[PDB]
Design a protein around this ligand. Sequence first.
Ligand SMILES: OC[C@H]1O[C@H](O[C@H]2[C@H](O)[C@@H](O)[C@H](OCCCCCCC3CCCCC3)O[C@@H]2CO)[C@H](O)[C@@H](O)[C@@H]1O
Ligand SMILES: *C(=O)/C=C/N[C@@H](C(=O)O)[C@](C)(COC(=O)CCCC(=O)O)S(=O)O
Length: 265
Amino acid sequence: SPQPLEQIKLSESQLSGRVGMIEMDLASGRTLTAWRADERFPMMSTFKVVLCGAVLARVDAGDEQLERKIHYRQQDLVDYSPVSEKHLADGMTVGELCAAAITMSDNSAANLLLATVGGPAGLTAFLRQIGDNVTRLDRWETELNEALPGDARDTTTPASMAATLRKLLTSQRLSARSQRQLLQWMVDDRVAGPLIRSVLPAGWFIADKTGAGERGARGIVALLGPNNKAERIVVIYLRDTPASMAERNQQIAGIGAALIEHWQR
Ligand SMILES: OC[C@H]1O[C@H](O[C@H]2[C@H](O)[C@@H](O)[C@H](OCCCCCCC3CCCCC3)O[C@@H]2CO)[C@H](O)[C@@H](O)[C@@H]1O
Ligand SMILES: *C(=O)/C=C/N[C@@H](C(=O)O)[C@](C)(COC(=O)CCCC(=O)O)S(=O)O
């Protein structure tokens, strides 16, 4: 594989779409690679990690408990609720809802949690409170991944998302236990985690949350590194490409291959 930047450019050429990417040291925030890092991209399901960061902040403040059981109704369910549709009778705890939202991308779980933090406006206010003045959530699942061309709703930038994830995972804004919980939910991703491990060379750590939307929108927010360590945050978003999901996945994987082959930078 060629150098990361060369590969990213090649991916735009092949997809006919825009790619946004940041590679950042998790411990220090050092930015290693930045491409269209200040341009907007739909967050799609990647917003679920930020959502649960807001939930954990409420737990730390004593305003929420991960144990608290939420009971909901069938009429509350939206498209794609693999975990939540199974608990209409017994409900789910707030912690279970975050696990379902992050590890299974359960949309109803995400909407139930979104309501607890004040909806899209409440989550956006949380982002402003931690210093992210760019990322914004405007809608609920599943309308939020519509990805209309030029629509600023429900978007982030690679730089903002990377900085925000680092703040949630390491800045001590969240308690030690909460930081560890957010990380573990990403490590436990069932949608792409196992698949990514199956193609990663031995020794490479992966934790992640993916997203998909209309007009080719696709993305991933991840922790990656050799020697089984979460060394870097890697955020990659794609938008406005007519390519098959398989090809969008392959191009993102190709950027990862370039990082892996040329890690020491
Ligand atoms: O010399 C480095 C490595 O080169 C190859 O590894 C390949 C691997 O066989 C392939 O499957 C993967 O594809 C990349 C798979 C990446 C999947 C997702 C990455 C995510 C992670 C972070 C966010 C964005 C994307 O590339 C590597 C590097 O070329 C060799 O197979 C391996 O033995 C060797 O150690
Ligand atoms: C989050 O990104 C969700 C995107 N797509 C879903 C949606 O529009 O709500 C789908 C229902 C597909 O969902 C999945 O394929 C599961 C994994 C979603 C993820 O990557 O987080 S829609 O068909 O696009």
